[PDB]
């Protein structure tokens, strides 16, 4: 792993405009030529890639970030193209302190490693427990806490980066708490639609309170509640490569404005515990 503050030279995908954290799975589906080629070559050499957090997306202005390592490879080769989909978890934050453009086009960005309350942790996960109860996976580590937290929890991209800011576990964990008393979400383009709180949500697996899935290129984080407001449903469940294996999916879309807030899961078998959930995307909504 990359020592502290250090300075190395770490490849950006352009098409990223996630925030990811130390710690927080990121699902990639290349189609470009030379995108493909980065990851590849990247395969050999440690496997390390840059994910920004952009603040103005439209600029890709992007102070700091997290690493980003792969995990998983697989090759696949459809309609005539060479596709590559691959997983890598967060593992470090950084400060950008540069990135210029090579002739290739392949963007890259040298940035400085950024270095690494327990009844703070636990009044925090006091507060987790009353919006849902659940049986453990949550990590033991303050350091760890404070990334799981920041990666599963309803929060706007703006408050997303200012705890990777924070270089401090006890100081993240502090701001954090402070934020999940700070109670509802809503519909981004109406900011007047209430769709659900904090007290619907929950986790289908240990990452279960948020994750991420692929557009089968698009990377959407859906959060995972058990009951919505103000959505229409539309058509009919289809089990069409369900995100979620053993479930039918359905699009929901805002009352008001038609903007699609998520999707709502159905099980196929009566015996699956959670049987009527909700899969919202959090681009579609905003936090009052
Ligand atoms: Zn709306």
């Known amino acids: 792993l990359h020592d502290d503050d250090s300075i190395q030279v770490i490849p950006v995908l ?18 470009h030529p030379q995108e493909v080629s980065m990851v590849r070559n990247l395969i050999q050499n440690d496997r390390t890639f840059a994910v920004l957090a952009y603040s103005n997306v439209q600029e890709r202005e992007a102070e700091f970030g997290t690493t980003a390592e792969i995990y998983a490879y697989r090759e696949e080769q459809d309609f005539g193209i060479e596709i590559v989909k691959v997983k890598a978890i ?24 950024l270095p690494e309350a327990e009844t703070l942790m636990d009044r925090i996960k006091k507060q987790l427990r009353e919006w849902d109860e659940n ?17 599963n929890l309803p929060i706007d991209d ?26 509802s979400l809503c519909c981004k383009q109406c900011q007047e639609t209430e769709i659900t709180t904090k007290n619907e949500i929950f986790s289908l697996s240990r990452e279960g309170p948020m994750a991420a899935y692929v557009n089968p290129g698009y990377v959407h984080e859906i959060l995972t509640v058990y009951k919505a407001c103000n959505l229409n449903l539309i058509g009919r469940p289809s089990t069409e490569h369900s995100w979620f294996p053993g479930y039918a999916w359905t699009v929901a879309q805002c009352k008001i404005c038609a903007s699609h807030i998520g999707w709502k899961f ?12 909700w899969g919202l995307t959090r681009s579609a909504l905003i936090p009052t």
């Open 90 to 113: 967060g593992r470090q934050r950084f400060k950008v302190l540069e990135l210029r453009t090579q002739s290739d086009g392949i963007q890259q960005a040298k940035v400085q490693i």
């Open 135 to 151: 049986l453990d996976s949550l990590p033991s580590n303050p350091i760890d806490f404070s990334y799981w937290v920041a990666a």
């Open 14 to 31: 352009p098409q990223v405009m996630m925030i990811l954290v130390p710690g927080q799975t990121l699902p990639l589906q290349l189609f």
């Open 158 to 183: 703006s408050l997303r980066i200012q705890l990777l800011k924070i270089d401090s576990a006890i100081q993240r964990l502090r701001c954090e708490l402070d934020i999940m008393n700070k109670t």
């Open 266 to 277: 159905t099980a196929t078998k009566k015996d699956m515990s959670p049987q009527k959930f």
